[PDB]
Amino acid sequence: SIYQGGNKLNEDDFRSHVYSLCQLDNVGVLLGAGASVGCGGKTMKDVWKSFKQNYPELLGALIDKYLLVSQIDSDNNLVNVELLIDEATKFLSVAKTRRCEDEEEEFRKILSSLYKEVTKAALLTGEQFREKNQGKKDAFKYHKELISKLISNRQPGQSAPAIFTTNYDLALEWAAEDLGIQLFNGFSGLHTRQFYPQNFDLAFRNVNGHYHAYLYKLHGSLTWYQNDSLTVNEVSASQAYDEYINDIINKDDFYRGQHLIYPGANKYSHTIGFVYGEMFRRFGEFISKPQTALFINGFGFGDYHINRIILGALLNPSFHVVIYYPELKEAITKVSKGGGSEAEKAIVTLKNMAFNQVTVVGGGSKAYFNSFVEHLPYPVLFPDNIVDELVEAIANLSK
């Protein structure tokens, strides 16, 4: 269930290790798309089912004329969405050069439908997306505990925690604004909010309140748009819903560059994108510094970039990592049978190393977001220890 360096580890020692791992100089987390399942989110598996059910006509064309997907994989619902986008874009680009009008519309329809399906699963509240004070609900009660535990475990003279994510939903912002705390994401201004890369080096100070954190979104957001003027703007949720989200969801018009996101395999296709590179540079720079700990939850290991970056970080004798993977036993069994997908071989390789700096936690339902939040400890405000634990010695001498 719990492995450290290829061996087996118990529970009490695991808790003691986790407690000691939160006292280092740098602590950070990385949250995937499975972390927001309890708040009302979806998963890429359900997107395929929704697309298949809602659009029964385009699937036939895709499987018949263009041979972009196999029949058995479609029936089993085990197809990769992040890969079909690249093939569809390549097909669209090839046809547009030779002036073939019939194929362009048929591929634009597929792209518009798939993008419409993707965006709808990030609202988390349906039509209630345009209301206010959504952070007071009971669903967003564990994010608040996570933030409180991450920030309360700090000593004066240390650095602030950092949070990395690969989602689009506005759960972290709502949870943080509920408690009245401020997060920094490189934006500033109210009426005209822009992106300034140098706003990541600013911290609070008392002239005569010391509670803040950073937040990096590695794949954009649902409220960021570009006007092609080499600038990026951010607006509120109700403003965005009134502007373009409602039209995209309901009017079923053709998709354009209303909002910038990165669904796909090759992230370098967007040449004029200068945000993605900046965020990944900050991630890589944060990793390299010594005396660092990192907790990973909700990640499916389906990205070449991230799991290629992680592997090279273990040559530093000051980097510790904790990885949660629910369905570990199935992957272990299936790799020995001949092999499986590329996502599972990576996690199997990590488990089998011989360094005492990698820990993998499995166990199905007990390696979820709630359990991960529960494992984090509370600080001890006031540290005799010479007789305090010796009082119970009299009690246990009463056999």
Ligand X SMILES: Nc1ncnc2c1ncn2[C@@H]1O[C@H](COP(=O)(O)OP(=O)(O)OC[C@H]2O[C@H](O)[C@H](O)[C@@H]2O)[C@@H](O)[C@H]1O
Which residues bind to ligand X, rule: CB under 6 A?
Answer: 32-35, 37-38, 43-44, 80, 82, 166, 219, 263, 298-300, 302-303, 326-327, 368-369
Strands 358-361 and 319-324: parallel
Instruction: Choose which of 164, 174, 224, 262 interacts with a copy of itself (CB under 8 A).
Output: 174
Strands 2-4 and 224-226: unpaired
Choice between 26 and 275, CB closer to ligand X: 275
Radius of gyration of the chain, Cα coordinates, nearest whole angstrom: 24
State in angstroms the smallest separation of the CB of 357 from a copy of itself: 8
* Least Cβ distance, residue 135 to a copy of itself (angstroms): 8
The residue type at 187: F
Among 52, 108, 109, 270, binds a copy of itself (CB under 8 A): 270
Distance CA(189)–CA(18), nearest Å, equals 39
3-class SS of residue 46: helix
On the 0-12 / 13-18 / 19+ scale of CB atoms within 10 A, 70 is exposed
CA distance 258 to 141: 32
* Residue 319, token pair as written in the block: 């980097």
| Cβ distance to ligand X smaller for residue 140 or 368 | 368
Nearest in space to 31 (alpha carbons), one of 239, 156, 175: 175
Identify what 72 binds: ligand X, a copy of itself, none; CB under 5 to 8 Å per kind: none
Residue of 11, 126, 190, 250 that binds a copy of itself (CB under 8 A):
190
Question: CB under 5 to 8 A by kind: which of a copy of itself, ligand X, none does 368 bind?
Answer: ligand X
Looking at the Cβ atoms of 72 and 393, the one nearer to a copy of itself is: 393
Within 21-40, the residues that bind a copy of itself by CB under 8 A are none
**Stretch 199-238: interaction string toward a copy of itself, x if CB under 8 A:** --xxxxxxxxxxx---------------x-xx--xxxxxx
For the beta carbon of residue 229, count every other beta carbon within 10 angstroms.
7
Binding window for a copy of itself (CB under 8 A); candidates: 28-36, 37-45, 110-118, 152-160: 152-160
Q: Where do we find the tokens 């592997």?
A: 311
Closer residue to a copy of itself, CB minimum distance, 62 or 361: 62
> What contacts 329, CB < 8 A, 6 or more positions away?
362
Contacts of 94 (CB under 8 A, 6+ apart): none
Token pair of 369 as six digits: 């977001």
Q: Which does 285 bind (CB under 5 to 8 A by kind): ligand X, a copy of itself, none?
A: a copy of itself
Please report whether residue 72 would count as binding a copy of itself according to CB under 8 A: no
Structure tokens at 240: 């965005």
Residues 98-127 that bind a copy of itself (CB under 8 A): 98-99
Q: Which of 15, 49, 90, 329 binds a copy of itself (CB under 8 A)?
A: 90
- Residue 170 binds to a copy of itself (criterion: CB under 8 A): yes
Binding residues for a copy of itself, how many (CB under 8 A)?
Answer: 111
**Rounded Cα–Cα distance for residues 240 and 104 (Å):** 29
Residue 43's binding partner, choosing from ligand X, a copy of itself, none, with beta-carbon cut-off 5 to 8 A by kind?
A: ligand X
Q: Decide which of ligand X, a copy of itself, none touches 390; Cβ closer than 5 to 8 Å per partner kind.
A: a copy of itself
Map the footprint of a copy of itself across residues 300-329, applying CB under 8 A. 304-305, 308, 312-313, 315-317
Helix runs in 38-187, H state only:
44-54, 56-61, 71-76, 81-97, 101-120, 142-152, 171-179
